[PDB]
Write an enzyme that holds these catalytic residues in place. Sequence first.
Site, short mmCIF file in Angstrom:
data_model
loop_
_atom_site.label_atom_id
_atom_site.label_comp_id
_atom_site.label_asym_id
_atom_site.label_seq_id
_atom_site.Cartn_x
_atom_site.Cartn_y
_atom_site.Cartn_z
CB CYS A 21 -0.96 -0.02 1.19
SG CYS A 21 -0.18 -0.37 2.78
CG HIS A 372 0.74 4.79 8.78
ND1 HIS A 372 0.66 4.74 10.16
CD2 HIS A 372 1.04 3.56 8.31
CE1 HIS A 372 0.95 3.50 10.50
NE2 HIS A 372 1.20 2.75 9.42
CG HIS A 380 -3.95 -0.24 6.67
ND1 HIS A 380 -3.93 -1.53 7.21
CD2 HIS A 380 -4.85 0.51 7.36
CE1 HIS A 380 -4.82 -1.52 8.19
NE2 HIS A 380 -5.39 -0.31 8.33
#
Lengths: 464, 464, 488, 488
Positions: A21, A372, A380
Amino acid sequence: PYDRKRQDKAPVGLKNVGNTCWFSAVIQSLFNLLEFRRLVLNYKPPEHRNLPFMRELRYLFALLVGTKRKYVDPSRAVEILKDAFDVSEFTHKLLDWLEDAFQMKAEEEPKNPMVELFYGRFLAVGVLEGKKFENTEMFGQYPLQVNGFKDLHECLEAAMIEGEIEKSGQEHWFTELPPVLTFELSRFEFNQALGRPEKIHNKLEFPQVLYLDRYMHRNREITRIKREEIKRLKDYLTVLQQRLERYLSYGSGPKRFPLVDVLQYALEFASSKPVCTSPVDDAAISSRSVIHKPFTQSRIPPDLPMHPAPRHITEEELSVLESCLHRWRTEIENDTRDLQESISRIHRTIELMYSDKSMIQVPYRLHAVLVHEGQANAGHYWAYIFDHRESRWMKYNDIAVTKSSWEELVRDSFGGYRNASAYCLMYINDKAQFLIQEEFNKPDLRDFVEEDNQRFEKELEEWD
Amino acid sequence: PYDRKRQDKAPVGLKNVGNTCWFSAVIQSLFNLLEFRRLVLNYKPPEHRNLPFMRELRYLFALLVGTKRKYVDPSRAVEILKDAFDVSEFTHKLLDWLEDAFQMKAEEEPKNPMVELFYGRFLAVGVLEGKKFENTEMFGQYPLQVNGFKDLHECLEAAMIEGEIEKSGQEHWFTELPPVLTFELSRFEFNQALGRPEKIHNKLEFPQVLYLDRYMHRNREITRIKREEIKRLKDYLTVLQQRLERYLSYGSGPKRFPLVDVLQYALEFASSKPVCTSPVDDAAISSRSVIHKPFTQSRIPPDLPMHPAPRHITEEELSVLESCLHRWRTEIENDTRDLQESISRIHRTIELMYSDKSMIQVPYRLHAVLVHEGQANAGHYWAYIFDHRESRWMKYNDIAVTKSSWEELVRDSFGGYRNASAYCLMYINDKAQFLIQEEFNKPDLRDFVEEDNQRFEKELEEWD
Amino acid sequence: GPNPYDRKRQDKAPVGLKNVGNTCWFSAVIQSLFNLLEFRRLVLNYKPPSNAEHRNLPFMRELRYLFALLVGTKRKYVDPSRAVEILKDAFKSNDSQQQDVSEFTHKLLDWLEDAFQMKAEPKNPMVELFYGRFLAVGVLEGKKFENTEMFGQYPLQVNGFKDLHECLEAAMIEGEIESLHSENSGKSGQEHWFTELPPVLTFELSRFEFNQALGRPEKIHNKLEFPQVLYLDRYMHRNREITRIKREEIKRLKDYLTVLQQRLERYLSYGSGPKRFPLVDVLQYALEFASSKPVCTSPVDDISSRSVIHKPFTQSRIPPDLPMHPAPRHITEEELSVLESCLHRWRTEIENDTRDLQESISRIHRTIELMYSDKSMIQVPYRLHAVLVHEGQANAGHYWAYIFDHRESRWMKYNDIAVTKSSWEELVRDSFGGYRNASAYCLMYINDKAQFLIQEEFNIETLPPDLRDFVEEDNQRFEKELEEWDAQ
Amino acid sequence: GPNPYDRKRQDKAPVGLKNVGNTCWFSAVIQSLFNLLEFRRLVLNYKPPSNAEHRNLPFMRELRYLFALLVGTKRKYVDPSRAVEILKDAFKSNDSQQQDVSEFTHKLLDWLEDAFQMKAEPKNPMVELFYGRFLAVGVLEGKKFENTEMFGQYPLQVNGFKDLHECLEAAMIEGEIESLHSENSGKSGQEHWFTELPPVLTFELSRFEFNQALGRPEKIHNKLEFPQVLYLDRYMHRNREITRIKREEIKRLKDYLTVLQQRLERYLSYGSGPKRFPLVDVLQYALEFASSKPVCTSPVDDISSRSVIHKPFTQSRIPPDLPMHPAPRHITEEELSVLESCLHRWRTEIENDTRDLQESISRIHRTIELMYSDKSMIQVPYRLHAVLVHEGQANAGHYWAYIFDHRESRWMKYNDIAVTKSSWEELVRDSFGGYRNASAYCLMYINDKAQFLIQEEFNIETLPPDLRDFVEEDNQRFEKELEEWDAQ
Ligand SMILES: [Cl-]
Ligand SMILES: [Cl-]
Ligand SMILES: [Cl-]
Ligand SMILES: [Cl-]
Ligand SMILES: [Cl-]
Ligand SMILES: [Cl-]
């Protein structure tokens, strides 16, 4: 899996390929920076595994402008990067390789077009126990600590000041600004109670347009003065906030209440009908209602003496109390209002310190926000990137590229609102019109027939 | 899996066989009831799949007294029960089959020894719009609703009273009590906010010894009187709690504070040095300390006037206030103490209502507690069962049989303390010494050589 | 009020003192001294020098009268106006430094000490009761020092200390000290050790700390406990080496105690976001979600009693098990089996660890509390005699006292005119802090080996003990005062 | 205070009224009436009957004087002592029923109505301004009834209503009504519909509800909003059939709105135990736990700057990734892959559902708020003229008012002697409730079509308008009063 990976005039997503990601965010950010997109697309090679990565990145951004599908598989690009071995170390190598790729292209013919976008220069002037020093450092991403700051300017100022300026001190002043200005917003601080470092969750705001005029070396004499005015104003602002707090949290014991209520309720007690005894001595829709005259009260309770009340009082006692507690209440009410006006007045003065036209000539517009969520060396990442031609914010979350808003961005990036907060801010110079360099009309990629094949291979949909 | 399933003079556990924790609880409860253990062990058969289940239960309790291992696999017993098809429907069929098994054994030769343990009789006397009725109903487990009750007696009384006794009403009175007395503690109530039924989490206490004297039909005239005394006392108890609340939550506005602080702090304000101006007009271990005389204060703050304070006051104004607010504070302080004494006094009176020797002659000792945690038609069950010979509480949780305490039991069964709360209470008559019928010494199961084989088969431990 | 039967002493109870315009501080300090029998005897059997500050000796005389009434007057309370007036006159000067109640209390004691000093012409019997000596050994950036300081009242900072021992230890330690210079180089530290203890041991409990939010100093309201008997053995210079090693052992134990409290907190306040919840619930509820019957659709669609027999261990009002939101949209039997095994085993792991951590923490806590419990650390007992309480603003408020009546073995509340039979339970609510707006500012302890301090003079004598029976004259006055009222 | 320049009216502002011993209720009701120009004209141009209660006509005369000063006196405030004394004398009888301020307000209005009634000898100009008619149609256990009741002030219960429309609707509805008897059988309900509206429309906002915990009636403090312009169209009898269908549509919508609010709550307050947390965090944190590096051991062991160049999108202060408690003891790569896929997909499912539910709820909310927004439901406007506020105990407290100055288009705070230029913002803080200890007890609305009510008499005349210029005499008095002060 029938007719699912197909576009609808929307930007292309990227596959997660495990926990990549972080890759999607950094790449989609770069890709949405048109000049950089052009540099990667119109790249021809002339040390490391940098050149195959640059070549695999070409095939990534080509199929990302040629679209045809809903999301692209970044597996081949990620595999080269992963073969060289936290996500920062990965991001660092990624950028290393790209810079080295452009360096080889330049060296063969020196200005590195990528280094020309992200890196700048600031001047560091100070004293070390009385001895002066002056250095001009090259910088890339300017890193900021967010503990205890309300916004980005508070944050940045605290970072461009070390110690006590006049004794040891240091001041940073921008001399050369990069057209693509990036900031790190570091939320990691050691939690003593938990016994480990953890992300801090206080709300730190940032604007859609940031004016870097005050941090400019040319404005050093002016900013220093404005800064001292704010020091004095914040000083005044404290004394008032302290006095106001004494009104709002009155009392000497463990439990404090507002003074105005202390006086109101004390008078309520005195004016109550005295009780000389101790409190231990002991579907109606069938009614013919009368006319109610205006300004009257119907459900008004009976006026009989009840506990708690004075046991006894004098008419003179009551008259003294009534005059005292009423005049003092008005005094208290007027002072809280007076204090609150002055506090807001000082706040407005501080807010408009750098508002004059001579401090509004270096505008940087927010282009991307990297968010984040979760644990420190986990969680992620996703991004909020601005679609400059469409004039709309977009949420880039692996495969999923959705039309967002500034309101969405703030909930996910300011902190406190959600478990997620921005870790990086990408600003673009508003004067720098060359970072958004779309092809004239007065889609048809610089690539050689690649996206035309993957759009035909995908056109192959079986029907039984 | 080497030397793990071996005992250490502790009771045997049971395998989970999926989600059969409910089975472990109900079985281990029955098994720890010695007379019932003897009835199942010394069972010889003479309709359904009841008799093979009874026979499989023999092999379960045999290997559970013969132990040899740490836990037994109840797979064969559970499989018969599961083949007949919520956990209550399962528990019901289980008991059906056991009762039917003992019925066939009795019918062939009538008293059902199992039905003789759990079932009793109560008398239901009442009126239905003026017309009287009187029925003697047989009961098993007496079901209780726990919403809004502080303890088991509160709970039970509310269940043995319906409507208004003297109009429609009903009173229940125990006539015949079972030696094994069981109660259901139903915590399911419809949550309007959630839009579904959910378990209620208020704390409901229960004793280690329960006296059922007051609920006995013979004590009906006496209990009715004691009950009316408590009605009157609770009435008085309210009026006091209402008045005390007016002292502790004083004020007419949205925010209430204790009256005593309202008076104290009001006087603190009056006695402050007046201020005529507005609050907007503006490693030391190197010291030679002096001797401190007793009863003195060193860090005592400076006495200078500060906001908030009166702007002005009269010496006569202050003397009036000082006399008022001080005398009224003592009045308030004395009344709160007086009210609190009376409340505790009424509470003690209610607590000792059924404490006299003529109301302490039907003791029932708690033998088992069946606990549940989690969602309504899910979660997990475990039990707290008393080891009468060892005089110690034990936690029976599938495979795991650990030496617990009453303190552990309460945290897990009262509710509020944890997400778990007892769903069932098993009491045994203290006069009924026949429910704990251990074999004389002045282990060697009634079984025929079965546990002797499974103890030899398990003795087979390979060593490579 | 005006009626003299109102101000009539109901015999078997001590005499109070009039407030005379915010002199509650005077009542407390005086009543405290007065209830210290040996001092009461020193003031009563006081005769000034033969040939003789112009305010100390008249104050001593005026206090001789005050004390004389407190023993045998027939009145409820007594007017300290003449004694207070001499003391207040010493501050009639407008150009002073600062006049708080401590400055007043200090001068009071000054005058009394000076009075006894003049009489000693040598041992000053007052100075002999209240003052002691401690040894101050330390370093100042590597350089050693050693001083034996005389002390009176040992002042303590209440801070965030839980009790008097925590409080006292923090005041008698600073940095780290050692035998060898190298083991001290580039360090600053200090240790206090009692060498001579006063029979009357007093502590100040300072709760004043600057409140940044309020912008002024304010009393701190955390609960600080103190015992009825305090063992001063560990703070003795002779017990220095034993206490040092026990102090070092507690250092090691507190270190361990932290690491555990940190790990336990990670279990109880789990999560990465702003709101943390217990880990055990995070796992339980996650499993609750997984085990719910799946729902493939979205939660949006817009625009008397004759009861049956209940078998034991069953449930009647058990709700229906039908699928509802929130639930998984879909799950695999294998997915569920993985989740069920994971989340259940990990929950047991989590539950066992929280229990294990909590046992160990309590175990370390018990070890620390019994550190100074052995026979060689309980030979210097000091029994609590008086507690001086304050309530309200700093430089304002009101003082009262809790003083122990050693002969009738009972606590007493001395609040001006009002002297009432109290309890230890009352004392704690008013003196520990947090419980009420009041908290003790001073503790008076007496050596348990120093019997004489609070023992009556042998015959047991309690009748008027000084030759100047001016008390008889005052009693005669009050008796005729009562007569005048009935005769009106 | 005693100085007459203190009580000098600073021209361009309205005249206040003296408090005369807790007569703040009188000031509010009077100042409200006085600021209603047509009523001011009726009282001013009042002449009593030719040949003529013994208290009503003197009260009307005394109030004629009061009103005369309020228009043209040179003084700051005015003494309502003579008017209040007549009114207070009507309750001088010890054997009365109960004497609250409402009983006083009622008698006041009684007397004024009776005064105008006597003059009408017929239309009573006072009764013509304040009273209206509504139709009450309903059933009483199946049996129908229909009454047209005369009303004055329409009383409302504040309860847990959010605004005036919520409040009013709840007061004009009870059960369910229908055309046919079968559709009503075994039911009780009632509907109120306005037939005749008074030009001066008043509402009582009753906040008194019995507090069980306190054991007495207490004012309720929830926020209840009211507009500056209220459209009474929906409550009109002529709009009955349209309102019925819209009322039924809102019934359907509120029904849907509930089911959603219930489901959303299950997402936001997930769990089976006493403490509930959001489901999204339950899944996130559960996955955080699973993805943590396993730890096989138990958490118990007992007994100036020259900075380097930072590349964009990187992290500097990023913490070390070493295993720590709490973590799984062990996990499988397959176990982790199952968990990672489950908990991530379900989290997206949960996140999407909360968003979907919240959109739909707001959508239904908007639909309900714009139900009566169309052109045919905004033809009966009533503009807010006055707000009567109360603060404090029931049967005590203090009243003040917010009255609109229609000519200078500005809100004014009428608090006894003090008449200050306020704002709508001020009014809301003091009248909505919750914001302060004060909340409006009465709202006075005026028909927007009824101009005359608050329009000045044509020439625009504002100079003394009544022939009895006793006001000139009083101004002459005050002027010489000022002189006397300077001349002392
Ligand atoms: Cl200023
Ligand atoms: Cl006000
Ligand atoms: Cl009673
Ligand atoms: Cl007190
Ligand atoms: Cl004594
Ligand atoms: Cl006007």
